[PDB]
């Protein structure tokens, strides 16, 4: 696929996967779009989508209780509510906007576990995603291990189904859309590569082997039709570091291609 994207791989010593489709211009850009990467926290809005797809109003307002023992690493929001519980919508908010890991687990559990969520996503057309573990084990990202992986094209396409297509009732679609727009963890990634005044919804991820991902939707200023985008990346070494600038630069290249 795209040639400036290839240069980024050498610059940052990574394997890079990119898929972006401009729904207005009817054009896409891709690079290694069918190669597997660990999705890490980017699964969270897909789990929220599946919840908003399959649960009743009552089920969304139901209080979910959990114990101190249930808390996994990095659970800033859920660790505040052990005694009283949280609703699925509050859990969704925490998972998407703060990347709360226990919130991720509560979503997986609500959907019947990773394998059941996988089956739900199969049924809306995602033939690619392979889900198996809970947080934080799902972040391992061992190369060649299929567990908890997808591709840039599949992540983008499935996000598109929930956010832009008709899988969700319009009211619930807006709830998900606003959680993504109000994400707090992505300022240095896709958001950093988009012009001022454009609206972005996104979900970031980070994990083993230097994995660094961001998926989202970009609405160019002026009511233009949206661009769906997924950027995934990983490195050779188990304890490798990532560089957020990779994601910003990939975004800039995508927009140069799509918008020109």
Strands 63-64 and 86-87, how do they pair? antiparallel
Q: Copy the structure tokens of residue 51.
A: 């919840």
Q: Which is nearer to Ca ion, 88 or 186 (CB)?
A: 88
Secondary structure tally for the chain: helices H, strands E: 9, 9
113 contacts which partner out of Cl ion, Ca ion, none, CB within 5 to 8 A by kind?
Cl ion
Is residue 130 marked as binding?
Answer: no
How many residues in the shown chain lie near Ca ion by CB under 5 A? Answer: 12
Q: How far is the CB of 73 from Ca ion (least distance, A)?
A: 7
Q: Which is nearer to Cl ion, 93 or 118 (CB)?
A: 118
Taking residue 150's Cβ as centre, other Cβ atoms within 10 Å add up to 29
**Contacts with Cl ion, residue ranges (CB under 5 A):** 113-115
Interface residue with Ca ion among 35, 62, 116, 132 (CB under 5 A) is 132
Interface residue with Ca ion among 165, 169, 174, 236 (CB under 5 A) is 169
11 contacts which partner out of Cl ion, Ca ion, none, CB within 5 to 8 A by kind?
none
Beta-bridge mates of residue 207 = 211
Q: Copy the structure tokens of residue 80.
A: 């505040």
How far apart are alpha carbons 119 and 113 in whole angstroms? 10
Burial 209-244, CB ≥16 within 10 A → b, else e: bbbbbbbbbbbbeeeeebbbbbbbbbbeeeeeebbb
In the bound state, the residue with its beta carbon closest to Ca ion is 30
Q: Which is nearer to Ca ion, 115 or 237 (CB)?
A: 115
Instruction: Single out the residue of 164, 167, 172, 155 nearest to residue 92, CA to CA.
Output: 172
**Active-site entry in 11, 59, 137, 221:** 137
Active site residue 237: no
Q: Which is nearer to Cl ion, 116 or 187 (CB)?
A: 116
Would you call 123 helix, strand, or coil by DSSP? helix
How far apart are alpha carbons 6 and 3 in whole angstroms? 5
Q: How far is the CB of 117 from Cl ion (least distance, A)?
A: 8
How far apart are alpha carbons 185 and 175 in whole angstroms? 18
Is residue 111 marked as binding?
Answer: no
Q: Copy the structure tokens of residue 204.
A: 């970031």
Active site residue 41: yes
Would you call 55 helix, strand, or coil by DSSP? coil
Residues noted as catalytic: 41, 137
Which parts are annotated binding residues?
23, 26, 30, 33, 57, 115, 118, 125, 131-132, 169, 171
Q: List interacting residues with Ca ion (CB under 5 A).
A: 1, 23, 26, 30, 71, 115, 118, 125, 127, 132, 169, 171
Which parts are annotated binding residues for Ca(2+)?
23, 26, 30, 33, 57, 115, 118, 125, 131-132, 169, 171
């Amino acid at each position: 696929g795209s040639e400036d994207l290839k240069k980024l791989e050498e610059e940052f010593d990574v394997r890079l996967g990119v898929y972006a489709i401009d729904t207005g211009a009817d054009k896409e850009i891709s690079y290694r779009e069918n190669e597997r990467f660990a999705y890490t926290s980017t699964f969270k809005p897909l789990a929220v989508g599946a919840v908003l797809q399959t649960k009743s109003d009552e089920e969304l307002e139901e209080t979910i209780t959990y114990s101190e023992e249930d808390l996994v690493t990095y659970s800033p929001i859920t660790e505040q509510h052990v005694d009283e519980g949280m609703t699925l919508v509050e859990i969704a908010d925490a998972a998407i906007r703060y990347s709360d890991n226990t919130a991720g687990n509560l979503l997986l559990e609500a959907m019947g576990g990773p394998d059941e969520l996988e089956t739900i996503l199969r049924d809306i057309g995602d033939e690619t995603i392979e889900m198996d573990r809970y947080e934080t084990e799902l972040n391992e990202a061992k190369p060649g291990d299929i567990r908890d992986t997808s591709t840039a094209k599949a992540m983008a396409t499935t996000l598109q189904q929930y956010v832009l297509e008709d899988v969700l009732d319009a009211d619930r679609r807006e709830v998900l859309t606003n959680m993504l727009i109000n994400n707090t963890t992505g300022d240095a990634l896709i958001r950093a590569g988009v012009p001022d005044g454009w609206t972005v919804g996104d979900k970031t991820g980070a994990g083993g082997y230097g994995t660094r991902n961001d998926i989202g939707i970009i609405w160019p200023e002026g009511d233009e039709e949206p661009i769906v985008i997924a950027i995934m990346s990983s490195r050779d070494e188990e304890d490798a570091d990532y560089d957020d600038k990779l994601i910003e630069k990939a975004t800039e290249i995508v927009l140069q291609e799509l918008r020109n």
